[PDB]
Structure 1
Amino acid sequence: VLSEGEWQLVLHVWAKVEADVAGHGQDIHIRLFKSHPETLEKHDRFKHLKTEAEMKASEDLKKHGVTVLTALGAILKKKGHHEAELKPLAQSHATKHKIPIKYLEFESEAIIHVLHSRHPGDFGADAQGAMNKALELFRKDIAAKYKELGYQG
């Protein structure tokens, strides 16, 4: 469980993400695909983006990052009360996209990296710990929904 103060730290840095959702999403995916190359293999339409400049220029990838971060931000703003928002994401990611929970951990690492790179002054130790707890809760709850649907993530 997160305290209310921890949720406030999560939502304080998230407001900074919201000043440029597209750019944060690009940086997150570029970091994810470089750090854990197996993850790019899940994205059929991004595999031909073979250099960083191609990834940054891709409208398709840019729009995808906004879709991802918007869903995550909506979940974070529920402060744990997120079953209704989480279920469709578990449904598609378990049954259509086939994303292991470990890949959600990889994406979480990239999120934390970009947040700290862009906002170090608003992403100190307490805020990092809060975001780690929030993203763990998200992943734990997704993992339970995966199993309820019959998918071992």
Structure 2
Amino acid sequence: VLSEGEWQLVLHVWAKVEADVAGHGQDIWIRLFKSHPETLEKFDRFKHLKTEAEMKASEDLKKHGVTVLTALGAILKKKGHHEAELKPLAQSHATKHKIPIKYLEFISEAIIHVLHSRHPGNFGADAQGAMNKALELFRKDIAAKYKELGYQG
């Protein structure tokens, strides 16, 4: 359980992300696809992308990034009370997309890497710790839902 102080550190850096959610989304998904190429194979719509240039030029991938970060932002703003938001997300990711917790760990790493790079003024050690705590909570809760839905994850 995160403290209010930790939630504020999370929301404070997220406020910066929101200045340009599309740009942050591109950086994050590109970082993920490059650090862990296997994750790209889960996207029938994007698995053909060969280079960072192509990824950057993809309007659909940009849209996907906005969709993803907006959903994550809504979850973070709930400050742990995200039961309603997690239900549909866990169902689609467990049953349709089949995204292992391991891949959620990979994207969590990508998110932290990008925020660390773009926002040193709001992502010091304490802030990163708070974000990690928030993302671990997210994955923990997603894992529990995966279990209920019959997915090993």
Which stretch shows the higher mean deviation, 56-65 or 42-51?
42-51
Shift of 1:44: 1.1
Post-superposition shift, 1:51? 1.2
Instruction: Answer with 28-37 or 41-50: which moved more.
Output: 41-50
Aligned mates of 2:91, 2:148 — CA distance in 1: 10
By how many angstroms is 1:25 displaced? 0.5
The TM-score with structure 1 as length reference comes to: 0.99
1:141 deviation in Å?
A: 0.1
SS of the residue corresponding to residue 18 of structure 2 reads helix
Matched residues, percent identical?
Answer: 97
Following superposition, the deviation at residue 47 of structure 1 comes to 1.7
Question: 2:49 & 2:37 partners in 1: Cα distance?
Answer: 13
Cα deviation, 1:35-75, whole Å, max 9, x if unaligned, reads 01110000111122211111111010000000000000000
Shift of residue 14 of structure 1?
0.2
- Return the alpha-carbon distance in structure 2 between the equivalents of residues 45 and 78 of structure 1: 30
TM-score normalised according to structure 2 size: 0.99
- Residue by residue over 1:56-111, the C-alpha shift from the partner in whole angstroms, topping out at 9 and shown as x without a partner, is 11010000000000000000000000000011000000000000000000000000
Shift of 1:8: 0.3
Identify unmatched segments of 5+ residues in structure 2.
Answer: none
Equivalent in the alignment of 2:36: 36
Quick one: distance in 2 between partners of 1:87 and 1:47?
27
How far apart are the structure 1 equivalents of 2:151 and 2:50?
Answer: 31
User: How many residue pairs get matched?
Assistant: 153
Report the counterpart of residue 69 of structure 1 in structure 2: 69
Gaps of 5+ in 1: none
